[PDB]
Structures are given as C-alpha cells and as structure tokens.
C-alpha cells in the first residue's frame, strides 16, 4: 500500500529558527535501498513550485531541510510529497504526502 518501505519521522518546524541554514528537519528513507541505490526528491508548493526551495531534500541521503526561517502568521502549512527512485528512474515507492505545520 502507500506506506510500502518508507521510513519517515514526524516533522517539527518551529518558526524564527537559528542558522546556519539550510537546517536538517528529518532524514527520510526507503528500505528498497537494500536491493539497490535510492534517490530522494520532494515536490509541492514550498519545494518544486512557488515558493520554490523553502524545503529541499539531499538526493543521496534523504535529509529533508528548511532553507530559511518560517513565519506562522504568513504561511501556517505546507503540503509536500516525498519520492524515491532507483538508478534507472523507476519509482520504488508511491509518493508520500507530508503535512508540515509551522509551530511556535
């Protein structure tokens, strides 16, 4: 089903964070990495579409990072989607919806 071999911790995103940016949030993984190398990406508003690159993911390690301080009263929520592909570009997981809430 949708979970498949995904391993994702809950994401805490406090507003007005201290640098250096980008700051690591969580390290995502697909256990399909034991049968071959996995490459991670993220889509959604705040990632590939405007505002572009508020959230980025390190392709080899799965480290999801925030690139700047967030502001609750400006944007309170972000809907992202994590993707996992093999060396041949095939999706090894169904994309996972990740709801990030900007806390105090």
């Amino acid at each position: 089903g949708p979970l498949g071999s995904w391993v994702i911790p809950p994401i805490s995103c406090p507003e007005n964070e201290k640098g250096p940016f980008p700051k690591n949030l969580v390290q995502i993984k697909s256990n399909k990495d034991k049968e071959g190398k996995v490459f991670y990406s993220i889509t959604g508003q705040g990632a590939d579409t405007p505002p572009v690159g508020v959230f980025i993911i390190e392709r080899e390690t799965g480290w999801l990072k925030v690139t700047e301080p967030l502001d609750r009263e400006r944007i309170a929520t972000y809907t992202l989607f994590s993707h996992a592909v093999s060396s041949n570009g095939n999706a090894v997981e169904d994309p996972m919806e990740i709801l990030i809430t900007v806390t105090d």
């Binding site: 089903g1 994702i8 201290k18 640098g19 940016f21 980008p22 690139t67 700047e68």
Partner: protein, 465 residues
Amino acid sequence: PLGSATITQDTPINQIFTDTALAEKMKTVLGKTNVTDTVSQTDLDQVTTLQADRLGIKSIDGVEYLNNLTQINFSNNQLTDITPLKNLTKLVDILMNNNQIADITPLANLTNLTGLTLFNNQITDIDPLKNLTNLNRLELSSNTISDISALSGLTSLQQLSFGNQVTDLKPLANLTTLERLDISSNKVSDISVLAKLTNLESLIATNNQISDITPLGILTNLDELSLNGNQLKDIGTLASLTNLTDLDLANNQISNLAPLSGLTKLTELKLGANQISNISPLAGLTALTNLELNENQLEDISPISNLKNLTYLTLYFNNISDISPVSSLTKLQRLFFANNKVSDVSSLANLTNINWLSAGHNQISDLTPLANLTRITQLGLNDQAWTNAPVNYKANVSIPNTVKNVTGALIAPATISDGGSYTEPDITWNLPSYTNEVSYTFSQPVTIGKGTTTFSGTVTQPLKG
C-alpha cells in the same frame, strides 16, 4: 555621498533597474503606477530594506542607487554578477542563497555585514570575505569551496557553514565565538581543530570521513551533535558531553554504546546502520522520545522496555524474534520493524495510539490481534515468510490453512506449489512421489483504521518421509 551612485535628474524606474522583474518590484516598492514613471534620488534614498526573493531576477543593476539599504533578500533568483552591491556599505544583512554567483569580490568592502547567506551558488574563492570581521552568521554550504583560509580572522562568527570540498579545518582555530557549526558533506577526516571551539553548542558534521572524535572531549557545551555517515567505532569521548539532547550517529561502525549511558538529557538518538547487538547501555535514557536502531545485529531488545517516553522507534533490519519489549511503550505513534523474525504481534494490541505500523518481511500469519488499532493511518505487512512444523508425508497430504486476516477469516492461497488445491480450510496435494516440501503463497489487501497494505507471504511446509 563619497563612493555612492546617485541620479541627479528624475529618471524612469526601468532606466535605473534594467532587469524587467526587478523594475516591476521597484515600481511597487516606490509606490508608482508604471515602470516608466520617473523617481528622484530622494525617492530612492527611502528604500532601507528589500525582500526581492523568488522573482526571476538576472541583474541587480540599479541597486547601487539604493544607498541606504541595510537588509536585502535576493535569494532564489538567477544572479551571477553582484557588482552593484560594491559601494552599499550600510548593508548589515544579505540573503543571496540559490543563485549562480561565482565572483564575490563585490562583497569585500561591506564591513558592516553581520549576516551573509550564500549557500547554493558556484563559489570556490572566498578570499573576498576575509575582512568582513563583523560577521556573526555566514552560510556557504552547497558551493565548491576547498580552502577556508579566508575565515581565519572572522572572530565574531557565531553561526557558520561551508562546503563541499574542504579537507583542512586549521583556519577555524581562533574562531572561539563559534556556537553553531555545520561542516557536512565535505572531505574532512581531521577535526582536531574543533577542540579549540569550546563555545560550540551545535556541531553538524554528516557525510565526512571522520573516525577520531577525541577532539570533542572538552566541548562540554554541546547540546546537538550529528556525525551521521562517517567512519566512527570508538565513541568513548561522548561520555564527556553530558549536555547532549540530540545525537545522531547513524551510518557508522559502532558496537559499544557504554559511553552513552550517562547522557540522560538525550531526547533524540539515532544509531541506525551500525554494528550494535547490546542495548543495555541505553536503559537509563528515559527522556528519549525518538530512537533509531535499524540495521544493526539486535536480537535481545528487552532493555528498550525502560524507554517509556518513546513516540518514534525504528528496529527494521535486525534479528529480532520477540517484539514484546516494545509493548509497554504505550506512547508509541510510529513503529518500524520490517526485516525481522517476529511471528507473535499480540503484545502490539497495547500500543493503542499507534499511527504508523511497518512490519513487512517478518513471520506474521495472523492479523486478528491488531484489529482494534484503528488510529493507524500507515500500515506495512508485505512479504512475510515462515516454515511450518513438519507433517507426515502421504500421497494425498492435507494441511489446514493458517493465514488469518484482521477479521478472523482465513485468507485463501494466491498460489499453491506442486499442483495443490484449496477447499476452505484445507490445502491438499496429491503428489506423484515423495517430496521434501511443498509451499503456498498469499496476497491480500487490507486496511486497519485508515492504513492500507498488502498482507502477503510465502509458507514452506516440510514433509517427513
């Protein structure tokens, strides 16, 4: 002003700011109706801040006339040449990450800069930063910097990051004001210089070649440490770091956890992808909410029962047969133990607040004990496998199907080896001769609460001669 660029006659906004996207931004900032409307130098002198991120700007030509700028944000644009910033000496903060900048020589005389964000550019040469002695924050990760000699005199730096070809950290020696350092994804093995940085509170050093952490011994103010993706084995030095609340040692070669036993302020601990077989040293770390122990050599996980504040736990890819020690951790919301030898999941009925339950590649044959875990939103039960106790061989051998769905109903085999058939509840084979074993598979989609998976597996049945 001396060095400053000023317009002497009222000039159209689009003749000052030649970039089409920046001209439109400046029209709004200046309170004009069209980009052709004229402005005076007095108008341009009113602009002290500029939030111009994510606008498709290729050139900041014209920004030299904004003499009173103290804070700019041109991050997430297409800038290469930043020559217009050369004489804006009132600038205190610049956010300019995610551009195509290689030449930072125009920043050299911006002595009032206390904040400079340049991560995700094409910078190799940081020599122009050497005299920005008032800098408190400097971010340079996702660049091609191999030489940090220019950082040596930046003795007010509190927050620093750089990358991604640095081997030699010696230039950091006199930067004792440093509190938060991020040297991740470089080519660093030798962190001996870090012993001098006794005010460090956070050290992120993932994806390096570090095997010797003895330099960290006197960094007693460290509350956050990440050595994920290095070559660590001996972590004895960590016993000295009693202020640690967040520790990430995943993807190393660690076996001896005794040095972590007294780090009772720990709330998050990542130890996945190591060589750990003994977790008794973790017994007293009762403040832990997040613990990762995946990809180790674990069997006896009994000491985990002490960690009553755990809400997140990974144990996937181990040799665990008895999952019951996790059953008294009633705050658990996400549990991952795929690729183990677990058959009895009945104790998991006690994890009433469980949301994510991932248990594929185990020996689970019966989902009935999980039926009331209706708060589940993510579930994994694929690719189970086990071998039944042997039954006596006969020419018309029949075994009872034992695969049970969450409802208590038997799940019919998807496939049956050796031409076997199914008439509920029995699988029957009529064999032409004696064979050592037969087998069957199952594959059944299932949802518990809102979590959906395929409960599948392979059952091997030995036949005694």
